[PDB]
Symmetry: D2
């Protein structure tokens, strides 16, 4: 199944934050309407924040997260959770190797803001 693709309400600000947990340098690309809108890159085995940003979901509301390590695409896992019918989290884990901890880059998208 496709992973890392989310439909947000149109024209809505959202936060995107990435953490790293791997020996490999993580490159996280955030697409809005199929065009790159943010890119973060960093290396940590201690959950360091490698980027955070606020983006707008635009007319389509389509947001996609991609993760790669030295050009090799990571396998993704994802889901969306909504609390009290208001607060949204779109969550992504990724695997760059063999251990299947799926934390090598972790990406959190949250909305609404403000």
């Amino acid at each position: 199944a496709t992973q890392g693709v989310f439909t947000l309400p149109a024209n809505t600000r959202f936060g995107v934050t990435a953490f790293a947990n791997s020996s490999g340098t993580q490159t996280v690309n955030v697409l809005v309407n199929n065009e790159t809108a943010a890119t973060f890159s960093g290396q940590s085995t201690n959950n360091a924040v490698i980027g955070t940003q606020v983006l707008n979901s635009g007319s389509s509301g389509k947001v996609q997260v991609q993760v790669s390590v030295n050009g090799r695409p990571s396998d993704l896992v994802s889901a969306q959770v909504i609390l009290t019918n208001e607060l949204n989290f779109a969550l992504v884990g990724s695997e760059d190797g063999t251990d299947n901890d799926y934390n090598d880059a972790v990406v959190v998208i949250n909305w609404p803001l403000g």
Copy 2:
């Protein structure tokens, strides 16, 4: 129901990260086995990452998040999600006012790390 309380794997490092979205200054306390282990604070209506820290869940694994504004406790919402039977997120929203957006402080706990 009780919210903002999570049983983590014992003795395990986790990330805890807080975001602010309110005119009120947020204070987030993170308790491990009923003792304050981290405190974050700030004021943003644009999702500022007011704190991020790596903690150990300790012998019992009990982690609790509390949020206050002006010394008054915010109302909390929470859940835990697990992806591919291994990647964990404990999620908290909080409300300091009347609009019920529940984003006034948002807290994300993630494990495993490394």
Copy 3:
């Protein structure tokens, strides 16, 4: 925070199914647009399905679950989960007593159907 309230896409069919795990008879009311659209009732300590039905979310998409036992509303917990950006679960637990297992009536709403 309010629990058991979900905004579905408008005019969309959804499944609603209730399970019982309590000494007490559970009555589950499913509201669409703030009117009771279905009622289930039964008693089980073995997770019996006490009702299942397909409903339409109607023009507003507002769906609410309420649970009563022994003449008093049960305390509710809830969340919505979306898998692969397609498959939606709106989940409700409820507590009629003191043990806080929150399974006394469990309600699962799923969409889309077909």
Copy 4:
């Protein structure tokens, strides 16, 4: 990533319930410790409960859901969500064709019971 595999607490009763939404007859097999413990089959495009049963997670706690149509495995998606640190849902969707609604068989596992 692997989907449809969950680790439950050992020796614990759980509910498993399957719904169908496809022109194809769904076969749902629920494995405990790698051996089939329940099986449900049926065709519906109206979310019929093609089966619901109480199982015990046994010594290993390992539960896996498999879905197929006339022997051909469906593609699975899954996640687990925990409410108020106690109430557990393990969720599975599946796709037997090309439209990616992932509702062709929907399986919900819930615990604790009683």
